[PDB]
Design a protein around this ligand. Sequence first.
Ligand code: QF1
Ligand code: QF1
Lengths: 304, 302
Amino acid sequence: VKPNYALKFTLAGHTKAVSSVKFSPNGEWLASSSADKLIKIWGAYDGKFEKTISGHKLGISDVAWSSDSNLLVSASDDKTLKIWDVSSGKCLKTLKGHSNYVFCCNFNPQSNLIVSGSFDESVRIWDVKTGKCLKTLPAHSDPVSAVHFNRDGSLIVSSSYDGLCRIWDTASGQCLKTLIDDDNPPVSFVKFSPNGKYILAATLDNTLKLWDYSKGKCLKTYTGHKNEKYCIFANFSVTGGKWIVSGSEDNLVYIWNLQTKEIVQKLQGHTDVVISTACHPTENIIASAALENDKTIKLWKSDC
Amino acid sequence: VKPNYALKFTLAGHTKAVSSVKFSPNGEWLASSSADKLIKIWGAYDGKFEKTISGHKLGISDVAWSSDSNLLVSASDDKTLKIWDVSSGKCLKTLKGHSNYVFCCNFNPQSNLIVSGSFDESVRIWDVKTGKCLKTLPAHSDPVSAVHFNRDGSLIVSSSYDGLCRIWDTASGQCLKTLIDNPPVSFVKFSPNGKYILAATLDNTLKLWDYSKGKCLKTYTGHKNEKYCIFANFSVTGGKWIVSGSEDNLVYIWNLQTKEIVQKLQGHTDVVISTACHPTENIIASAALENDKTIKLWKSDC
Ligand SMILES: CS(=O)(=O)c1nc(NS(=O)(=O)c2cc(Br)cc(Cl)c2O)cn1C1CCCC1
Ligand SMILES: CS(=O)(=O)c1nc(NS(=O)(=O)c2cc(Br)cc(Cl)c2O)cn1C1CCCC1
């Protein structure tokens, strides 16, 4: 069994490299962010452009949705995050405190907190309602590439170019676990697995690894794509077959069998690095986005 | 201070009346049961359907979570209770012994015991590990409408259409107290601090009792409850509220101390038979009978 993702729509509009794509939790929308300082909202099923959201003063590296799909948070090189009302496009709050580019962000499942990571090497936890910074974690000794909450919000995982992944207790701010090897290439992405027991980490040795972080054991590796430079998102695809999905610096989307690690599909069409992919929450749909020779988002659909 | 619960999601999927909704202790999930013989699991923050759990041969009246959120127990008209692994959906044990419909169930905080009540007028205490019945208590003289453990599991409270609430010692099975006009008692549970019980009677009244002193400290009224066993709850995450469904299709919310109705949630199109309060967020789940068949999730700032 292999998926058969086929191209359905190409979405143009951004005027610099795209940086992130995310489907809303209710399945209805895709949000994209770009170095052009904009967020764009698109229909998830037909690619229809819905709106542009503007106000950051420099490029945007990441965007994340609240669980009720009503809010977005964005992380910008202007050293802020912004919380947006998706329906109106209005900026509700500007989150100030990082001292350099904000690279990654996420809401907790409860969506009362936002976590952010920055080039300033810190991880910050923010109150959604007030916009205030609740905690600053001295998390890493180099830029922070990803931050993600687990399924009950009680943990955060962070990754950094310092080579580490760390697990944090949300409520206390304490580091519960550091994952480190004899060799520690930059970690360019991390997230919790669907069941919360694993983390999937990308390193710039062209490799994805699935770790049991409690036991400190690497269960699976996914290779054959190209990733030595950019922070490229990876995903778990849960709607049909159990796949790992990632972009790649050879302009393809790679899809692997979770268990066997075999590459099961490569999606061809983009004309630059595929910096970001997202998997739809209920349908077998992938969104992919590329850097500045391309500047487009593609929507792909599969039977499994 | 008054809450401002607003509708966030409507969860459709059951094909007959919903009978109970419960949040998992870790806050991640809502479990629902229905007369359609199914349990459904839903995401607590995005309302997304997760899975259906099936195997009972007749409708289900109640479902309850273990304290690690890994197991469910369900009580059915098929006269059995089933213990389920939530991750796999598999039935681990079928608890056999009641001679009629099983109406209510709960784990203790340690989650090594389950308590059940039945139309057979008994309360049973079951070993989770083996599924064996440990004790049968001749608890009531009419159907048992609710059973609940206190904060550490040392006590059980039961209620019945016979008009009584009874407090039982878990370890010994002995009745420590009987609270005795005697309208049918359609629901009971211990308060968060274990010192009170909140009891619903089919005279449209919720009462908060100090059961050790035999004193009724508060009543909550203004809703409609003369027929169904409607759950009620203590809301501990924001303001101190009592929450209940109602036979006029609304969710009622009262101030614990003043007994004032502070909000009524409108949206359901049938009796709101069950409500649940999320363990850490100000989120209510409500569920309704068969003209409606949906669960609604509501969110408040306090
Ligand atoms: C193969 S397996 O199906 O047995 C399995 N499930 C998990 N859990 S996971 O990574 O969180 C997860 C990933 C996806 Br993609 C989808 C879902 Cl639903 C999901 O739960 C891991 N594995 C195996 C690989 C490593 C241990 C055995
Ligand atoms: C008003 S009060 O705050 O003084 C108060 N607390 C309790 N304890 S309770 O019922 O277990 C309880 C209920 C809720 Br709802 C939430 C929490 Cl957290 C909680 O602990 C009772 N009362 C008063 C009602 C009658 C006696 C005085």
